[PDB]
Design a protein around this nucleic acid. Structure first.
Ligand SMILES: [Mg+2]
Ligand SMILES: [Zn+2]
Ligand SMILES: [Zn+2]
Ligand SMILES: [Zn+2]
Lengths: 104, 81, 263, 98, 133, 38, 765, 157, 65, 280
RNA sequence: UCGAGAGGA
């Protein structure tokens, strides 16, 4: 129920999806990620009202490419990016801790 | 004086509204529906639809200052509202 | 790694200042917010009053208690009342402590968080211990008592998220910045005569090349480098805050992926 | 000139509530008047012995604060000891449109 | 892939900021064509135009086929993109200049162009302004 | 209380009032310009 | 009074209001608690018993539920104190008090109910907080303010009311208030301000947001517009952005003195098919002014579109501000030394002049102005003098304002703007006045203890030299305050005095209504007007238009009207029509040209009599001009080729249309005469703007198109006829009540005959 | 002052004009004064104008001055509304007032009349006069609680 | 009343320094800003909470009950 | 009613009559739409709240508390609302109590001069970031502390609605009083505008269906409320007229029914008839 | 049950 996926009605290869119990937190991230796809033809999102963590997002892509697969690839890329960031931070922090074991 | 009636053939917005309201009333009573149902569960929309394609069997007895009246069938009236 | 490049300029048990490059704006903003909001942590929820012979009102007191920072190393080992099948509460999803103080001498008796006594068993989990940054270790000043005032009460704290209520806020503050030289022209500095003098230079300016007047605006530029100083209240070390927030955002995206697979 | 006397201080011409008005000499008159008026409906603390006093319609602020920009009249007003309000952080801008 | 009905080189007569930080009002005289004068609003911020500059000015009568608006990334295959400042919009007006020239008016999202051409017999709704230099 | 204690009623602003009653502290409604404070 | 003319009622609610940018015009935020307290007694039918049954199963404890079930026998079953909610089976004709849901037409009221605009119904939009939501724009006609205003709620109980409300007080249906032939509402506050930044020439938008605004717009066509900027980078224009919101087919074309087809200042406003070209969007275009965008859209599409228009316009503007932001500050008020210095001399420049005249008066050399006392004239020039300096100071201050100045930006947009503010805000506040006079000697020959007796120096009599930012000296502060109470007194006094005036007027015209015979009588049937408003036309479809036949030189009108097919003076160009020499030399047609010309010539002198003032702009039905452009755009008419029209076709059509302008119906000549009288002015202009010469040279339309215009005109003309049964007097009274809240005792002097005049005077030519 | 005078060329032009403005009102005498335009003479005191010229002329006169008052603040309302009210003020062949001595002193339905500012007084007169109301009146219908014969109710379906 | 626990803006905990705050103010005879700096309240969003707070509790306790 | 027992006091008067006083307490948490006022006459109500992150934030990671529309300021001529923020801000940085007394030499110049010394924009501007993207906000925001206050008018204390509640006896009209389930006093104005709309029926509905609806019986012989209605027997009669056939049912306002009865007390004969004696 | 008074919109 957290994810309601429907096809768009105003353009081909287009879909509108609603995320429940979510806000711009994941919104801007996923939106930029999809915008970073070569094969996407359109992407954007919004919220009906501040009163809900209801998150409605429309996308369009090239022929023969599932927009749902676009989301999947976007998420995979994001998680890879986050793992890399975390590991970089872990190394940086271990060294900064060796430095900070004397001053905290 | 149905002949040479001294008024417009155009329905009045008030007249339109009253017709709509009466039909909504009788629909809510489950009166014989003059139209097929296209999912228009709203009685108000049912009335609006009958108005659109002209199936209301109503006639307005419009009054004049002198107390004289003209009876105008919705059939006679023109709907531009 | 080739991902976002991190360089800590300064680190402290209270706060850590660093630079994050090789990343887009959205990821930085998301990191900021997820740290701000989505972090499991422990906070006082249930307050049962045995006796209040104090000037301060009960609800006043409980409100303040809700603000007490807590040992939150292993909150992951702790669970949510929503999930936990215990009634009311239990150690698996809650921590129990008490406060019992009584005025003894006419002088004001300052009741501090250190007075708090953990009752439930931590299972050895590094959780629940009150957090004290006092030089004297007194702890947070809960309240004050008269010559012979009695105040006894029990508290049950539970695992929740700041987003649910600020009392679960582990993130004290987040300094955040980029393009100190405004090379991206994302702002038109307001000024009477000249922004250059009227506006002060941010300290980060020294770590980036000052722009050149003759340079055409590189419209292709993007905000890659970022400056972030994250300060925690004290519930958890800053490094843990960063790591855990990253992990939570990862979990959110992974849950999205799982929902996609489920449909 | 042959001045016979001198006001000990012009601010003396001011009123009780108006005394709470900061820099009143820079605002447009009726605006000042209204502020004096709302000063009769803002909450704070009425008296220290509220617990002793058995009354109705009490309203005690959880955390009264002394205004940053005080007025010389205040230290007679005792408003510093008994203020009503908070020095909140205000942002003069349009953010969400609401 | 285009059929531009106009093409000429214009020397920049004047550059006017017009109390704007990105766009300047610009006048220019067509090289070799005293009868062709160009008024144009240009985002100098992205196109560092200078006074007296000789710019290649033409209108994409037909879309310069790269071989709802198609997305960006139109650099994949080659077209009349050798130009530097390329705008799109509509032919605003077709005023007749003494039956000798046509002070046609154009708008580019509000950015305006006027040009005198009965010689440049171009007529349509929308096209692209192609500026090289 | 502070003002209300010093409040003054006018049974149903001149220069003389200068230095006597606050030209600003006046209620709204019909009382406006009638009820004064010292 | 307290029981019949007014009473308490039920099914009603009242609470404080709150805003919602995300909300539509006919929608309203309904506090969930209220919904749980208000329901509707709907009648069970086969087409709703299903959800009704479920609603009953939900019961009173659930937000989408019901509280009582009413059997046909009248058994108002209580589900609150009964488990029967899961047991009763609904039967047709049963009534169930269904919890008010969304989309339910409901009525509001902001008190005091000044006039009609106070009364609009809306659609329910439940919300989880304890206050009402209102779409920003509606407030002005509501005369609302979010300082904590409360508003009444009225919930209809009989569906006939639902429709009745839905067709008589639905928000869009009154978008134009007939009190002043202008939009009742418009864009306001931040949105008004923000647009200016959005629509300004200098703006540009990155694709990231352009993608966003499109889906942010609810009714977006789903089409990606082309970026204005291509080669150096993809980008669009705010003008482009706003155009997407606008619906197609709009052809508002406003010109200004600065309009030259180039408009470096982008004044005026020009849009084609919704595509913006010229003019920075300003209050004059999207405000409540009649000459603005909204009014046009209202007639070109109809109310049910404009509702979408607002939300579409609204939602965008707030967004683009969200990622831009907007603020102000003291810097917006401060100016440079030079500016203040210049102001400084300006004040001193006046002060000496005051001093100069002062000595002159002291000399007994200043003479008394005609019919006026030297004492007052001495003051009159004095107060006059001080006004200019205060005025010029703001003028001077205005010149040196930077574009970055937000307030200047605020004022230039017109959102709550006021020049005098900034001048007072920045320059000297200016003279204080009471009963329009300087400070009187409340003390013996003086005003305050700080001034010697018998002094008239500007400051000594209430002038203010310093600026608000500079801080008023006690002397200034006191004087400035004095004027305050004056305004304050009239503020309260009006809140009661106007109502008494207002109440009388309503009764005075209560039984005044329009009759189906196109006449006006009282409850006694006594005629008031033979033709309502003497034209039988509803004000709601009237707007000011040019009367071209009035203005211009005598030589002028003939040139722009007269055509000669025989001589050289007014030779028609044959190329204008597919027929050339076939027409030229045609005396028969030339005759046809004649009666029109003389007819127009008669009209010119006739209108001269009508409007002795020479003004050629007056409220009339149907914008002929607008329709013409629609025709041009209707088929993108080629105005460079001959047309198939013929003069006979032109001449007959105007004659035919005139015949078609039938408001009355009585075939008796007496009625027919009135019909001729009613449309007299309108037909004259019709002849004017439909003159063959104008029809040919300027308006190069096709025969098919030209006729389509005629058919188009009559359609609107008929639609514009005032409806019968109108409670016009009540409307007219309200038309007077409103402006009363904003000379006025003079009005009261009018309403109450009061033979004893206050200010008797004569005007002698 | 100037005037919008159509010039011999056909165009309206500014024509400066001298006009006398004075205190008081006496049309009877001034109208006899030579060297003036008696026809164009205007004044504030419409009440006198009506007496001087006629009820209908005053009706227009009232509009002008009323228009001036509304125009005085720069606001605008449609011509019709202004015209409607004044015309009512003269239907009785005289300058009717909207006060208790004018509009109220009518011959309409008492129930309509009673609800204005005087109720009990008129009530006695009605019984004294054995008056009877038509029920066409709104408030009378309101008192009855019946759909007034107006607008949406001005007709029978 | 009594010192708030967390910075209204930051949430940074402060209901522990009141004692040291007054110590520096009186025992060290410093100006307010000096101590606040010594207290680590770099952001004026934090400084404000402490510069303005008026201790009323000490007065309430003066009552016998 | 929402609260708990705070204190109960039991005592007697000088006469020994027992008296009890009960104190209860609750904490009101600022709700949307609650009135706030400045120290300058600026007022308003709460629009909507957010979480710290959502609101725009400073480079130094500072979250604003309250946001107000700039448009309000210049139109209302309230500079000091800005000035205090400047001086107040300086006070916080300088940690020195401010002085807002009038007619002093204090001026923006030294104030702003001092601010720049602390290292902040002399006019109080600051560079903010969108609380949704983090993208730098194109404009700069006026930002700083200020003293506000909370006014007694509580939204939850204002809400009020009802339907089919108790109705007041004298007129069978809806009772009045929020605590007493009061109605809304439908005044003269509303119907007037309704008349303008012309929604007569919806006028008939409220005045009738909302209240005062009542069935009455009238004698054709005399338009007087004198009909005996033996509903238990379906038997009717008008004594004096002794007519058992000219009885008609009518729905009239209950309050009006009293008026006629009041009028009949006045000795007036406002006889009513459903049959217009006029022919044409 | 009335009366008064405060306050809001
Ligand atoms: Mg208000
Ligand atoms: Zn547990
Ligand atoms: Zn802080
Ligand atoms: Zn009888």
């Amino acid at each position: 129920s957290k994810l309601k996926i429907d096809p768009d009605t105003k353009a081909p290869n287009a879909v509108v999806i609603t995320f429940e119990k979510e806000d711009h937190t994941l919104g801007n991230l996923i939106r930029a990620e999809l915008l970073n796809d070569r094969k996407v033809l359109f992407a954007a999102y919004k919220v009906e009202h501040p009163f809900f963590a209801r998150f409605k997002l429309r996308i369009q892509t090239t022929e023969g490419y599932d927009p749902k697969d676009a989301l999947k690839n976007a998420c995979n890329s994001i998680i890879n990016k986050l793992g890399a960031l975390k590991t970089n931070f872990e190394t940086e922090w271990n060294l900064q801790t060796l430095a900070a074991d004397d001053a905290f | 004086p149905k002949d040479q009636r001294a008024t417009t053939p155009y329905m009045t917005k008030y007249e339109r509204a009253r017709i709509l309201g009466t039909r909504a009333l009788q629909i809510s009573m489950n009166a014989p529906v003059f139209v097929d149902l296209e999912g228009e569960t709203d009685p108000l929309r049912i009335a609006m639809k009958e108005l659109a394609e002209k199936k209301i069997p109503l006639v307005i007895r419009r009054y004049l200052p002198d107390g004289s009246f003209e009876d105008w069938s919705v059939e006679e009236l023109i709907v531009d509202l | 790694e080739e991902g976002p490049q991190v360089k800590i300029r300064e680190a402290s048990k209270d706060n850590v200042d660093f630079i994050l490059s090789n990343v887009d704006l959205a990821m930085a903003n998301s990191l900021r917010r997820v740290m701000i909001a989505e972090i499991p942590t422990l906070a006082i929820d249930s307050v049962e009053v045995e006796t209040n012979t104090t000037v301060l009102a009960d609800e006043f007191i409980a409100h303040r208690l809700g603000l007490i920072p807590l040992q939150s190393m292993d909150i992951e080992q702790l669970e949510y009342s929503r999930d936990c099948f215990c009634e009311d509460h239990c150690d698996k999803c809650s921590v129990v402590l008490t406060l019992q103080a009584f005025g003894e001498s006419e002088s004001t008796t300052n009741v501090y968080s250190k007075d708090l006594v953990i009752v439930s068993n931590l299972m050895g989990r590094n959780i629940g211990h009150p957090i004290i940054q006092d030089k004297e270790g007194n702890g947070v000043l809960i309240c004050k008592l008269r010559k012979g005032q009695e105040l006894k009460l029990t508290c049950v704290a539970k695992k929740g998220i700041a987003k649910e209520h600020a009392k679960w806020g582990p993130a004290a503050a987040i300094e955040f910045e980029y393009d100190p030289w405004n090379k991206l022209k994302h702002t038109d500095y307001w000024y009477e005569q000249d922004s250059a003098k009227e506006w002060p230079q941010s300290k980060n300016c020294e770590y980036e090349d000052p722009p050149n007047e003759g340079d055409p605006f590189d419209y292709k530029a993007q905000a890659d480098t970022f400056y972030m100083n994250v300060e925690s209240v004290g519930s958890i070390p800053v490094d843990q805050v960063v790591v855990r927030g990253i992990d939570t955002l990862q979990k959110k995206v992974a849950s999205i992926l799982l929902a996609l697979t489920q449909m | 000139t042959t001045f016979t006397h001198c006001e000990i201080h012009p601010s003396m011409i001011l009123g009780v509530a108006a005394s709470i008005i900061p820099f009143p000499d820079h605002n447009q008159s009726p605006r000042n008047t209204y502020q004096s008026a709302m000063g009769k409906q803002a909450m704070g603390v009425f008296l220290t012995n509220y617990n002793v006093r058995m009354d109705t319609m009490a309203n005690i602020l959880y955390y009264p604060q002394k205004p940053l920009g005080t007025t010389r009249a205040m230290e007679y007003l005792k408003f510093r000891e008994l203020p009503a309000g908070q020095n909140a952080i205000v942002a003069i801008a349009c953010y969400s449109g609401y | 892939m285009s059929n531009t009905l106009f093409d000429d080189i214009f020397q920049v007569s004047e550059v006017d900021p017009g109390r704007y930080n990105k766009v300047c009002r610009i006048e220019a005289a067509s090289t070799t064509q005293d009868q062709c004068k160009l008024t144009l609003d240009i985002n100098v911020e992205l196109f560092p135009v200078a006074a007296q500059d000789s710019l290649t000015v033409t209108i994409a009568s037909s879309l310069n086929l790269e071989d709802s608006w198609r997305p960006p990334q139109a650099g994949d295959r080659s077209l009349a993109d050798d130009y530097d400042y390329v705008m799109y919009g509509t032919a605003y007006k077709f005023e007749e200049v003494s039956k000798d020239l046509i002070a046609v008016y154009y708008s580019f999202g509000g950015l305006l162009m006027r040009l005198e051409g009965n010689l440049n017999n171009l007529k349509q709704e929308n096209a692209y302004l192609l500026i090289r230099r | 209380t502070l003002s209300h204690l010093r409040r003054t009623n006018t049974p149903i602003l001149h220069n003389t009032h200068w230095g006597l009653v606050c030209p600003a502290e006046t209620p709204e409604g019909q009382a406006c310009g009638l009820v004064k404070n010292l | 009074r307290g029981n019949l003319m007014g009473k308490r009622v039920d099914f009603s609610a009242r609470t404080v209001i709150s805003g919602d940018p995300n909300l539509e015009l006919d929608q309203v935020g309904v506090p969930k608690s209220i919904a749980k307290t208000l329901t509707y007694p709907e009648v069970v039918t086969p087409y709703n018993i299903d959800r009704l049954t479920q609603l009953v199963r939900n019961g009173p404890n659930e937000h989408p539920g019901a509280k009582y079930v009413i059997r046909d026998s009248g058994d108002r079953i209580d589900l609150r104190y009964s488990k029967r909610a899961g047991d009763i089976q609904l039967q047709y004709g049963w009534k169930v008090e269904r919890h008010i849901m969304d989309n339910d037409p409901v009525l509001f009221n902001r008190q005091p109910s000044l006039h009609k605009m106070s009364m609009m119904a809306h659609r329910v939009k439940v919300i989880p907080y304890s206050t009402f939501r209102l779409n920003l724009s509606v407030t002005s006609p509501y005369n609302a303010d979010f300082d904590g205003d409360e508003m009444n709620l009225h919930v209809p109980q009989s569906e006939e009311t639902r429709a009745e409300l839905s067709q008589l007080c639905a928000v869009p249906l009154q978008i134009v208030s007939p009190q002043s032939n202008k939009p009742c509402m418009g864009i306001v506050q931040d949105t008004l301000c923000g647009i200016r930044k959005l629509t300004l020439r200098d703006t540009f938008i990155e694709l990231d947001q352009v993608l966003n605004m499109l889906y942010w717009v609810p009714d977006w066509d789903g089409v990606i517009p082309t970026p204005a900027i291509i080669k150096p980078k993809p980008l669009w224009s705010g003008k482009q952005i706003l155009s997407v919101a606008i619906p197609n087919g709009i052809h508002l074309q406003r010109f200004d003195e600065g309009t030259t087809l180039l408009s470096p200042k982008d004044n005026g406003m020009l849009i084609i098919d919704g595509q913006i070209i010229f003019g920075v969007v300003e209050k004059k275009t999207v405000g409540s002014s009649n000459g603005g965008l909204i009014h046009v859209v209202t007639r070109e599409k109809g109310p049910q579109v404009c509702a979408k228009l607002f939300g579409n316009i609204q939602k965008v503007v707030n967004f683009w501000l969200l990622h831009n932001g907007f603020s102000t500050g003291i810097g917006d008020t401060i100016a440079d030394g030079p500016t203040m210095r210049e102001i400084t001399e300006t004040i001193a420049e006046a002060k000496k002049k005051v001093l100069d005249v002062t000595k002159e008066a002291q000399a007994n050399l200043l003479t008394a102005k005609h019919g006026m006392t030297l004492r007052e004239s001495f003051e009159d020039n004095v107060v006059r003098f001080l006004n200019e300096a205060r005025d010029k100071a703001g003028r001077l201050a205005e010149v040196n304002l930077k574009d970055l100045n937000n307030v200047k930006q605020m004022v230039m947009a017109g959102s709550k703007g006021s020049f005098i503010n900034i001048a007072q805000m920045s320059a000297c506040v200016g003279q204080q006045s009471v009963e329009g006079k300087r400070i009187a000697f409340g003390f013996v020959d003086r005003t305050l203890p700080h001034f010697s007796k018998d002094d008239y120096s500007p400051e000594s009599k209430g002038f203010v030299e310093n600026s608000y930012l500079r801080g008023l000296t006690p002397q200034e502060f006191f004087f400035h305050a004095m004027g305050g109470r004056e305004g304050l007194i009239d503020t309260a006094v009006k809140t009661a005095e106007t109502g008494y005036i207002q109440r009388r007027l309503v009764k005075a015209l209560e039984d005044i209504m329009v009759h189906y015979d196109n006449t006006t009588r009282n409850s006694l049937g006594n005629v008031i007007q033979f033709i309502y408003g003497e034209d039988g036309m509803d004000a709601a479809h009237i707007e000011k238009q040019s009367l071209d036949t009035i203005g211009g030189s005598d030589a002028a009108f003939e040139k722009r009207y007269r055509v000669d097919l025989l001589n050289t003076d007014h030779t028609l160009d044959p190329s204008l029509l597919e027929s050339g020499s076939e027409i030229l030399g045609d005396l028969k047609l030339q005759v046809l040209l004649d009666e029109e010309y003389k007819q127009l010539v008669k009209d010119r002198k006739f209108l001269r009599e009508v409007f002795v003032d020479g003004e050629a702009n007056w409220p009339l039905p149907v914008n002929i001009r607008r329709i013409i452009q629609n025709a041009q755009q209707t088929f993108h008419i080629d105005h460079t080729k001959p047309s198939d029209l013929t003069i006979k076709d032109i001449v007959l059509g105007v004659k035919d249309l005139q015949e078609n302008l039938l408001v009355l119906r009585g075939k008796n000549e007496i009625i027919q005469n009135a019909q001729r009288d009613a449309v007299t002015l309108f037909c004259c202009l019709l002849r004017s703007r439909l003159a063959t010469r104008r029809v040919l040279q300027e308006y190069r339309l096709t025969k098919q198109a030209f006729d389509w215009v005629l058919s188009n005109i009559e359609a609107q003309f008929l639609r514009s006829v005032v409806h019968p049964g109108e409670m016009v007097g009540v409307l007219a009274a309200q038309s007077i009540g409103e402006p009363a809240t904003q000379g006025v005792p003079r009005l009261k002097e009018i309403l109450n005959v009061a033979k004893n005049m206050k200010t008797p005077s004569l005007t002698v030519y | 002052y100037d005037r919008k005078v159509p010039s011999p060329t056909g165009e309206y032009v500014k024509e400066p004009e001298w006009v006398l403005e004075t205190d008081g009102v006496n049309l009877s005498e001034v109208m006899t004064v030579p060297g003036i335009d008696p026809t164009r003479i205007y004044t504030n005191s419409f009440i006198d104008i009506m007496e001087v010229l006629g009820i209908e002329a005053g009706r227009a006169a009232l509009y002008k001055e009323v228009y001036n008052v509304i125009a005085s603040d720069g606001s605008y309302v449609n011509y019709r509304h202004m015209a409607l009210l004044v015309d009512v003020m003269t239907t009785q062949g005289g300058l009717t007032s909207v006060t208790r001595h004018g509009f109220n002193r009518s011959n309409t339905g008492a129930l309509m009349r009673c609800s204005f500012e005087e109720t009990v007084e008129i009530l006695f007169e009605a019984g004294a006069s054995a008056e009877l109301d038509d029920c066409r009146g709104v408030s009378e219908n309101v008192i009855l609680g019946q759909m007034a014969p107006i607008g949406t109710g001005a007709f029978d379906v | 009343m009594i010192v708030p626990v967390r910075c209204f803006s930051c949430g940074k905990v402060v209901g522990d320094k009141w004692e040291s705050y007054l110590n520096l103010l009186q025992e060290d005879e410093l100006d307010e800003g000096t101590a606040l700096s010594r207290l680590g309240l770099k952001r004026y969003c934090c400084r404000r909470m402490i510069l303005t707070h008026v201790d009323l509790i000490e007065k309430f306790l003066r009552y016998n009950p | 009613e929402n609260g708990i027992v705070d204190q109960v006091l039991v005592t007697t008067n000088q006469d020994g009559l027992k008296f009890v006083k009960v104190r209860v307490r609750t904490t009101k948490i600022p709700q949307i739409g609650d009135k706030f006022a400045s120290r300058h006459g600026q007022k308003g109500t709460i629009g909507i709240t957010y979480r710290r992150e959502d609101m725009p934030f400073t480079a130094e990671g500072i979250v604003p508390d309250l946001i107000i529309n700039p448009h309000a300021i210049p139109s209302r001529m309230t500079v000091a609302h800005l000035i205090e923020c400047l001086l107040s801000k300086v006070a916080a940085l300088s940690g020195n109590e401010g002085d807002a007394s009038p007619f002093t030499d204090i001026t923006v110049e030294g104030i702003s001069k001092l601010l720049r010394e602390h290292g902040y924009q002399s006019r109080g501007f600051e560079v903010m970031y969108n609380g949704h993207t983090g993208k730098k906000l194109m404009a700069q925001i006026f930002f700083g502390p200020t003293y506000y206050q909370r006014l007694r008018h509580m939204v939850d204390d204002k809400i009020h609605a009802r339907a089919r509640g108790p109705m007041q006896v004298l007129t069978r009209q809806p009772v009045e009083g929020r605590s007493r389930d009061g109605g809304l006093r439908f005044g003269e104005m509303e119907r007037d505008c309704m008349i303008a709309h012309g929604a007569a029926s919806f006028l008939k509905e409220r005045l009738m269906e909302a209240s005062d609806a009542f069935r009455v019986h009238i004698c054709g012989i005399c338009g007087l409320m004198t009909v005996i209605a033996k509903l238990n027997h379906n038997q009717f009669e008008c004594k004096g007229c002794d007519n058992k056939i000219d009885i008609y049912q009518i729905h009239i306002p209950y309050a009006a029914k009293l008026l006629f009865q009041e009028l009949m007390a006045m000795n007036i004969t406002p006889r009513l008839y459903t049959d217009r004696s006029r022919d044409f």
